[PDB]
Design a protein around this ligand. Structure first.
Ligand code: SAH
Lengths: 119, 8
């Protein structure tokens, strides 16, 4: 799974992660993807660890959106439009080829999962 | 808790 900007491959952080295929400048757009949005309670349990949420709504990012791993020291950030219809991943610093691209899931994601170890 | 969703 890849495009001109990134590639998906095994990550040292866990499972699969998104990596830079080319160098990125600070503030450059890494990925823009559409999201499927529905009330929080309509998602079952399958995607509990993947979904993004705002208030009573949750969104499942398509494209590479749901594959980005988390880091306490991320090199990218994510934002979702009103209605959570689209998500954008922007770098917050220069990223070199081969470097994993990470975002911040937010504290509660991890605090609510004490059995899971954060890398 | 699910992931945060920062506003634009
Ligand atoms: N910094 C980190 N440390 C440990 N696990 C992480 C992590 N960032 C992401 N993950 C893993 O990724 C999950 C969310 S989905 C992200 C893609 C996932 N790595 C995969 O292969 O499908 C988390 O719940 C966790 O299991």
């Amino acid at each position: 799974m890849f495009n001109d900007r990134v590639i998906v491959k095994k990550s040292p952080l866990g499972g699969y992660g998104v990596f830079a295929r080319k160098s990125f400048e600070k503030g450059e757009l890494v990925e823009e993807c559409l999201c499927i949005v529905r009330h929080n309670d309509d998602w079952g349990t399958a995607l509990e660890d993947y979904l993004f949420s705002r208030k009573n709504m949750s969104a499942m990012a398509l494209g590479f959106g749901a594959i980005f791993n988390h880091s306490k020291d991320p090199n990218a950030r994510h934002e979702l439009t009103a209605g959570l219809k689209r998500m954008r991943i922007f770098t917050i610093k220069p990223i070199a080829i081969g470097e994993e691209i990470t975002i911040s899931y937010g504290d509660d994601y991890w605090l609510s999962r004490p059995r899971l170890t954060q890398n | 808790a699910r992931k945060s969703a920062p506003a634009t």
